[PDB]
Structure formats: C-alpha cells, structure tokens
C-alpha cells in the first residue's frame, strides 16, 4: 500500500509528459487525475491504519550512500506525522487536478501543465515520507524545480519567466543553508536518520543544535515565505490559478513548517531557536495582514492571506506546541485551497478576466455559487465559532497569552492584529467584488455566468471540509494527552493546560469582538461613507497607503540595493581582476614588458667593430672587481635597460 | 486561425491542442500501463515493506542496554 501511495503520482506525470502526445489532451488530464486519486484512496487507508491502529510502514528500496559510517537508504516511512501531512497534500492536490481539468481547457498546453503538476505532488509526497533528512532534501529541491516550471509555465510571458527565477533562486538560498545544516548533522552525529538523530537530542551540545537548527530555520523561511525571504511569494501569482492553489495551500509554502515540526526532538533542546521563530512568525503575520488591506489584486490578497496564516503556525512552533501548528496546517489547507479556487472561478466568469477588485462590483447575484464559497471559506478563515478554522486558529492566539512570558505578550498583539486584519481584508475583498456598486461595463454583467460542473465539484467538497473538518479532527491532534510522540514536547514546555483554564475571560472573546464588530464599521464606510477613504488628498494617508501597498518597500530594497550590488561585485571582479590585474600579471602585461625588453635587445645586434670591441674590454672588469660587487653590476645593468 | 507549425514541432507533450487521430486506441494501451504498474506496485509494496515497531521485542532491547553497560 505504501509503495502505491508514494510513487503513483510519478508515473502519472511521466505518462502525460512522455505519452501525452500519443493520447491527446482530454485523456492525458484524466489519467493524471486518476493517478492522484489512486494515491488519495491509498493514503486514507494508511491514515486509518496509522493514526488509529498505531501501526507504521517502512519500505526501504535500496542503499544510497555508503561512505564509511555515513549510510543513507532510499527508505520511505509513514508515521503519524508523515500521514498527517499526506492528507492535506494528496487530498487537496487531487481536487486541484480535478479543478484544473476545466480551468485549463482553453490553454493549448495541457499535457505539459499536468505533467508538472503531478510531478510537484510527487516531490512533496517524497518530501514528507522520507525516513531521513536526505530523502527529504531530494523532495525539498524538486519542490523548487516543479514550482519554477509551474510558476513560469507561460514562458512566453516575460513577467512569468522572471518570477519563476525569483522563486528558484531565493529557495536555493535556503537550500544552501539546509545542506549546511545536514553537514553539521553528519559532523555531530554521523547520521541523517530520524531514528538516530532524534534519539540523541539531549546528549548533544546546545551550541551544536543551534548551528544545525538555525540553518533549518533559514531554509524554512524561504519555503514558508516569512519576513526577510518573502519577496518571491507575491511574485508567484504569475502561474495559473491552479498552481497558486496547490502551492500555497498544500505544498512548499507549508514545507517550512514541516521541517521545523519534524526536527522537534532537537528543537526543544535549544530554546533560542524557538524564540527566533516566535518573532519571525509574529512579525510576518502582522506585516502581511497590514499589506493585504491595501492590496487591490484579488490573488495578491489571498496570497498575502497565506503568508499571514502560515506565520501563525510559526508562533505555535515557537511555544513548542507542535500539535497546534500541525493541526492548523491541516485546517488551513482546506479553506485556503477553496479561496484560490473561488478566486479562479470569479476571474473565469467575468469575460474580461480582470483581477483588480477595483473593476468588480455587485457580483453576488450573477454568480451566487462562487460568492458563497468565498463567504463560507472566509468565515472559516476568520475563525467564526463552530467552524473549522475556529477550532485550530483560535487556540493558537490564546496560547500566545497562555505562555505568560514577555515574548508571548508582545506576539499576542501582533497575532491579535493578524486576526483583526484577517477579519478586515476579507470584508474589504468580499464587498469590493460582490456587494459594491458595479465598475465593469454593462456588457460584462449581461454575460456573467457560473462555470461548468467539473469546475464546480472541487469547491463544494472543500466547502464541506471547511464546515466540518476541524471539529471532527480536533481530538486527534489537540487531544489532551493523545499519543503523538512524533512531535516531542519537553515537560517544561507544556502550557495547553493553562491556555485552556487560566486565561482572562475577556481575551477568549477579544479576537471575535474586534473581528465582526470591527467588520461592520468598515462595511458601513465602504457602503455609506466612502468619502473618508479618498486618501490621495491627504499626504499622511497617501504616504502610509503607498508604503503598505508597496509591501513595506521590501521589494524595492531587495532589487535596487541587494541584488544589484550582488551583480555589481560580479562586474568589479570581471573588470579589475579577470580582465584587470590578472591580465596585467598575465598575457597583456607580459606582452608590454617583452615588447619593451626585446626592442632594446634588437637595437644591440649591429655589425660594428667598435661596439663588439668595447663590450669585450668591459668584461675584463669582471676579472678585476671583487666578486662581492656582482650584484651592483647586476643593478647597473638593469638600470641602463631603462 | 493561427498555425501551429505541426509539421516538424513534435514535442513529447504534443503542442498547441494536439490530439492524434488514433487517440482512443492509444489510451487503452496507456490505461493498461497505468493499471499494469499500479497492480505491480501493490505487489512489491506488500512484499517488501514491514512494520518497524515489531521487529524487536522489548525483552530483546532490555538485554541490549545492559550489555552496552
């Protein structure tokens, strides 16, 4: 079952890639969707047999590296955590492919698009089911290979080409650090296995765990797109809408979290790393909430929502509650897949295929089905009580306060603002596109219809999960004392008791009261008092709006300063060293010298008795002078060359 | 409409809405291959996999920790 669950997407990607010509467009898509569906059903069988029946599977293909003590196998295991990640991955990716059967129907290249997409799913499957860090690293890179090919799928488009390169180069920045982390893992323990390294966590020096895990954190910042290495995340919207759904809900944007959760047995023995993740995971949630409220492109808003939600898991990791970060990861993949799908449905329906929500308006009745999916998903995103995002996101916000440390208090407000902004940019997104006065021309509104039933099925199925998924699965992960040793919690880091019992009675409602209560106020302004927001007149507001709309001016800082300086150092090396000092101490310089020396020596060979006779008699001086004067005659000779 | 230059450009993934005339025949040849391999992969998965929590009983481990002592 395991071998069927892992490699089924792979042969699906090959068949579309290598036989897609011989079986055409229609069959290539469906055979690919079949391969992911085979892995979905196989995964669910193992989920039952692993999570409930306490069983583990390990297929070890063969040996990979056997350099003295360092031994690495092509070994694949499925523990509780490996199968806890194969539900969000394979399930969502199957619906994405089912969704993408119809979304890409008007695109000429559908055999290549699906070949990449199933390749991307296979790499992520290999990423989470590998039994050591190297097998993880193999899938960790083909995530970036498949994402680069997916993001730049429309290679004729200049913008999609460079945004694909921006994703690959920034990810390879973390990949370089991830490799360096593995080397210090071999240096300290001579192994990269899970069964070995985690069994030695306490006995190892604290400084060594920090060196390894800081590298893991930097690598995870790249994939999960946290502050500092996040400029690429919003450039990723150049790919087709299905790519954004699969890569920002059930793939690499979450792979940064998995690496930290997998290495929990080491992460609990270096609290400095946890403290850094708390701040990186708190600052990122704050920023992308603030950026989203003044973002106009619809897919940018949802993409920024992913960065804020993904950062929420980071602070859950920071307080050593890995069970909370894992459970929210599952719950987030459900509605956030739906929101991108519903965004794709809206843009497909409008015949101009616009994306600026400033050219929408009054869509709620022409596409009632698309609107409801956003409505139910957004409420699940905003943690309305009784939904799925409520039972996973809300507890994390409590546990920031339940930590009862300085950092927990400061991050508590950054997180609470993130919950606030989530409830705000959602309301801004829904009104501007479904309830506002129309902005598009009339001919668009007379030609606005929903989409085919193939495109409709995946959304409704994710909607149901966004209403019932979190409640059913809550006790499997957040259960008080459920055996989940794959995530290791040192006894001095458990605060789930005080998170649930000791919190002030006003905080337990604080996110929701500013959530919907603050939502109405903004709704009225957008509806009844829009004159306040005519911000171009106010220079204080225009400066503030420009700053956050330009994403903290971080994108301009990277390109204008950091990248160009990096390329400039290449130029200075290419000018003053390679064609500079090395040619002066090389071909060009020695040609100049030899031209000077040989031009003197040619002037000396001439038939003349007086010249040859005078030279001979000078040489009799070498018999007269004492031999210690030779070097002075050596210098005098060198002078007359000049 | 526009021209795909399909006389020579024949990539493995077709190109610009490519569909061969005998596509129904080839798919059944391909649908066999997916079925042939999925069945084949299931056999190997059952035969070559194991449970890494039952290979050694705790009674055997308890001798290992003491022997290393």
């Amino acid at each position: 079952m395991i071998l069927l669950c892992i490699f089924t997407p792979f042969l699906g990607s090959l068949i579309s890639g290598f036989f897609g010509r011989y079986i055409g467009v229609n069959s290539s898509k469906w055979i690919v969707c079949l391969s992911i569906f085979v892995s979905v059903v196989s995964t669910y069988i193992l989920f039952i047999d692993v999570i409930f029946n306490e069983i583990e599977y390990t297929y070890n293909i063969m040996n990979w590296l056997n350099v003295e003590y360092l031994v690495v196998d092509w070994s694949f295991t499925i523990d509780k955590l490996s199968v806890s990640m194969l539900v969000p991955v394979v399930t969502v990716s199957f619906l994405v492919h089912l969704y993408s059967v119809s979304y890409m129907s008007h695109d000429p290249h559908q055999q290549r698009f699906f070949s990449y997409l199933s390749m991307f799913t296979f790499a992520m499957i290999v990423l989470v089911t590998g039994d050591n860090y190297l097998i993880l690293f193999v899938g960790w890179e083909f995530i970036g290979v498949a994402s680069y090919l997916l993001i730049s799928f429309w290679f004729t488009r200049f913008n999609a080409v460079k945004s694909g390169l921006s994703a690959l180069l920034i990810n390879r920045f973390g990949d370089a650090l991830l490799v360096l982390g593995l080397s210090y893992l071999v240096l300290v323990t001579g192994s990269v296995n899970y069964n070995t390294v985690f069994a030695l966590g306490s006995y190892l020096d604290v400084n060594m765990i920090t060196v390894i895990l800081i590298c893991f954190l930097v690598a995870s910042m790249a994939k999960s797109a946290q502050l500092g290495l996040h400029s690429w995340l919003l450039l990723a919207m150049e790919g087709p809408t299905p790519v954004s759904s699969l890569l920002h809900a059930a793939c690499l944007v979450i792979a940064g979290v998995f690496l930290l959760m997998r290495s929990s047995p080491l992460l609990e023995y270096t609290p400095i790393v946890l403290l850094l993740i708390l701040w990186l995971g708190g600052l990122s949630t704050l920023i992308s909430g603030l950026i989203a409220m003044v973002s106009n492109d619809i897919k940018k808003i949802i993409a920024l929502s992913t960065m804020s939600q993904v950062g929420i898991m980071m602070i859950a990791i920071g307080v050593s509650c890995y069970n909370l970060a894992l459970f929210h990861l599952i719950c987030h993949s459900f509605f956030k897949a739906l929101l991108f799908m519903s965004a794709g449905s809206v843009i497909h329906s409008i015949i101009s295929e616009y994306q600026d929500i400033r050219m929408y308006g009054g869509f709620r009745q022409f596409i009632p089905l698309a609107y409801t999916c956003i409505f139910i998903a957004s409420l699940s995103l905003m943690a309305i009580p009784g939904l799925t995002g409520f039972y996973s996101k809300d507890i994390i916000i409590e546990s920031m306060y339940g930590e009862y440390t300085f950092s927990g208090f400061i991050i508590y407000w950054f997180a609470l603002i993130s919950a606030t902004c989530t409830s705000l940019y959602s309301i801004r997104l829904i009104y501007y596109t479904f309830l506002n006065n129309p902005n598009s021309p009339k001919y668009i509104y007379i030609n606005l219809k929903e989409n085919d039933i193939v495109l409709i099925t995946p959304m409704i199925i994710l909607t149901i999960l966004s209403i019932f998924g979190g409640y059913l699965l809550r006790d499997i992960y957040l259960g008080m004392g459920s055996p989940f040793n794959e995530l290791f919690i040192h006894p001095n880091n458990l605060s789930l008791i005080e998170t649930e019992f000791s919190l002030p009675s006003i905080l337990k409602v604080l996110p929701l009261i500013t959530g919907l209560g603050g939502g109405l106020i903004l709704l009225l302004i957008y509806e009844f008092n829009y004159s306040l927001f005519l911000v171009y007149n106010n220079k204080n507001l225009s400066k503030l709006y420009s700053f956050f709309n330009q994403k903290i001016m971080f994108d301009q800082l990277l390109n204008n300063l950091i990248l160009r300086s990096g390329l400039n150092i290449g130029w200075l090396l290419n000018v003053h060293i390679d064609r500079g000092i090395l040619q002066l101490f090389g071909p060009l310089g020695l040609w100049k010298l030899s031209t000077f020396i040989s031009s003197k020596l040619n002037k000396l060979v001439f038939l003349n008795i007086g010249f040859i006779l005078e030279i001979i008699v000078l040489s009799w001086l070498l018999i007269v002078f004492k031999v210690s004067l030779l070097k002075y005659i050596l210098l005098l000779i060198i002078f007359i060359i000049l | 409409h526009h021209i795909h230059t399909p006389s020579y450009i024949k990539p493995p993934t077709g190109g610009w809405n490519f569909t061969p005339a005998n596509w129904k025949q080839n798919t059944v040849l391909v649908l066999v291959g997916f079925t042939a391999c999925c069945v084949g992969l299931y056999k190997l998965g059952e035969a070559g996999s194991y449970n890494p929590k039952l290979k050694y009983k705790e009674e055997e481990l308890s001798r290992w920790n003491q022997s290393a002592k």
Binding site: - | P20, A21, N26
Partner: peptide, 10 residues
C-alpha cells in the same frame, strides 16, 4: 467552436 481536428496517426 474549437473545431480543432485530430492530427495524424502516431
């Protein structure tokens, strides 16, 4: 209509 006919036999 798409009206894209099948290509040759492969």
């Amino acid at each position: 209509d798409h009206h894209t006919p099948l290509g040759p036999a492969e």
